């Protein structure tokens, strides 16, 4: 394939995490001695086409801030998708446990710009992530951040519309039109990017502080939004707010969001 490889070139170690379906384990590709991350599905998780669709899309992606595909075991079960191992783990715990003087507002801003560049790229490809949030972002050396997905992906491309059975979307990151009418697009990924910008600014606080899940949409619909986090620059907050525009089409594209970061500065 170019990508095909085989197990027992790989030692499977412990879990790193997973999502509604899919579990990711740390492992070693013995030969080239590299520690790697390998996603698997379960014995009776009948989501083959979904897993295959994730592997297929990943082969089309080449960007410095999108986790790197190394290979795949798709000729026979168990099927594996193998990517590089990101030394610092997920962005959400990184933020919650970090030395803030070292991970300061400027580093938060650079982290945001790197995610925005990954997204603009997905956007050119017409790929929709569908679960963008800090817990799905990963951290390498020297604050390097990359977008990834610990769950069996629910991505959608310009040719696909499927998802694994009972796919549930986290209310606090999911755009209104997506929750209420199941309408997903690049623009819903832009809404999620706004919430992630908010996670980054607050060092990984849980969104919509002081509101029950049951009121989130209703308040959104009445024009309430999360407030500017302490120390978050106004232009960064403005960008969050534009991402949270009610009408999907009034949200900026990822190309505009990246440009705004470039010209802030
Ligand atoms: C539009 C495409 C979106 C997309 C979907 C799926 C993946 N799939 C992974 O992210 C992935 C695949 C296989 C194994 C692990 C893994 N990541 C988790 C991890 C954890 C620790 C660790 O060390 N490494 C990886 C990515 C994307 C992407 F990147 F485009 F956004």
Curated annotation (Swiss-Prot):
The keyword Ribonucleoprotein does not apply. It is linked to Leukemia, chronic myeloid: A clonal myeloproliferative disorder of a pluripotent stem cell with a specific cytogenetic abnormality, the Philadelphia chromosome (Ph), involving myeloid, erythroid, megakaryocytic, B-lymphoid, and sometimes T-lymphoid cells, but not marrow fibroblasts. A chromosomal aberration involving ABL1 has been found in patients with chronic myeloid leukemia. Translocation t(9;22)(q34;q11) with BCR. The translocation produces a BCR-ABL found also in acute myeloid leukemia (AML) and acute lymphoblastic leukemia (ALL). Interacts with SORBS1 following insulin stimulation. Found in a trimolecular complex containing CDK5 and CABLES1. Interacts with CABLES1 and PSTPIP1. Interacts with ZDHHC16, ITGB1 and HCK. Interacts with STX17; probably phosphorylates STX17. Interacts with INPPL1/SHIP2. Interacts with ABI1, ABI2, BCR, CRK, FGR, FYN, HCK, LYN, PSMA7 RAD9A, RAD51, RAD52, TP73 and WASF3. ATP binds at residues 16-24, 39, 84-90. Non-receptor tyrosine-protein kinase that plays a role in many key processes linked to cell growth and survival such as cytoskeleton remodeling in response to extracellular stimuli, cell motility and adhesion, receptor endocytosis, autophagy, DNA damage response and apoptosis. Coordinates actin remodeling through tyrosine phosphorylation of proteins controlling cytoskeleton dynamics like WASF3 (involved in branch formation); ANXA1 (involved in membrane anchoring); DBN1, DBNL, CTTN, RAPH1 and ENAH (involved in signaling); or MAPT and PXN (microtubule-binding proteins). Keywords: Acetylation, Apoptosis, ATP-binding, Autophagy, Cell adhesion, Chromosomal rearrangement, Cytoplasm, Cytoskeleton, Disease variant, DNA damage, DNA repair, DNA-binding, Endocytosis, Kinase, Lipoprotein, Magnesium, Manganese, Membrane, Metal-binding, Mitochondrion, Myristate, Nucleotide-binding, Nucleus, Phosphoprotein, Proto-oncogene, SH2 domain, SH3 domain, Transferase, Tyrosine-protein kinase, Ubl conjugation. The modification Phosphotyrosine is found at residues 21, 25, 161, 181. Widely expressed. One of its GO terms (cellular component) is nucleus. This is Tyrosine-protein kinase ABL1. DNA damage-induced activation of ABL1 requires the function of ATM and Ser-214 phosphorylation. Polyubiquitinated. Polyubiquitination of ABL1 leads to degradation. Residues 10-261 form the Protein kinase domain. The active site is at 131 (proton acceptor). It is found in: Cytoplasm, Cytoskeleton; Nucleus; Mitochondrion. The modification Phosphoserine is found at residue 214. The keyword DNA-binding applies. GO terms for molecular function: actin filament binding; actin monomer binding; ATP binding; bubble DNA binding; delta-catenin binding; DNA binding; enzyme activator activity; enzyme binding. GO terms for biological process: actin cytoskeleton organization; actin filament polymerization; activated T cell proliferation; activation of protein kinase C activity; alpha-beta T cell differentiation; associative learning; autophagy; B cell proliferation involved in immune response. The lineage of its organism: Eukaryota, Metazoa, Chordata, Craniata, Vertebrata. Belongs to the protein kinase superfamily. Tyr protein kinase family. ABL subfamily. A motif (Kinase activation loop) lies at residues 149-173. The chain holds residues 233 to 497 of 1130 of the full protein.
């Amino acid at each position: 394939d170019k990508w095909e490889m085989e197990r027992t070139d790989i030692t499977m170690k412990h879990k790193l995490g997973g999502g509604q379906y899919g579990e990711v384990y740390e492992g070693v590709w013995k030969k080239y001695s590299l520690t790697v991350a390998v996603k698997t599905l379960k014995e009776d998780t009948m989501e083959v086409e979904e897993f295959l669709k994730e592997a297929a899309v990943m082969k089309e992606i080449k960007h410095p801030n999108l986790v790197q595909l190394l290979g795949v075991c798709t000729r026979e079960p168990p099927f594996y998708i193998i990517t590089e191992f990101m030394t610092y783990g997920n962005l959400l715990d990184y933020l919650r446990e970090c030395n803030r003087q070292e991970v300061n507002a400027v580093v938060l801003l650079y982290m945001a710009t790197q995610i925005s560049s990954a997204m603009e790229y997905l956007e050119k490809k017409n790929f929709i992530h569908r679960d963008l949030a800090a817990r799905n972002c990963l951290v390498g050396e020297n604050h390097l951040v990359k977008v990834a997905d610990f769950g069996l992906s629910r991505l959608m491309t310009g040719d696909t519309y499927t998802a694994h059975a009972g796919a549930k979307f986290p209310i606090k990151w999911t755009a209104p039109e997506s929750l209420a009418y199941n309408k997903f697009s690049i623009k819903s990924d832009v809404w999620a990017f706004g919430v992630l910008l908010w996670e980054i600014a607050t060092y990984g606080m849980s969104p919509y502080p002081g509101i029950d899940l049951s009121q989130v949409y209703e308040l959104l619909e009445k024009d309430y939004r999360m407030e500017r986090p302490e120390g978050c620059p106004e232009k960064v907050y403005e960008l969050m707010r534009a991402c949270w525009q009610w009408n999907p089409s009034d949200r900026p594209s990822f190309a505009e969001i990246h440009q705004a970061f470039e010209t802030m500065f």
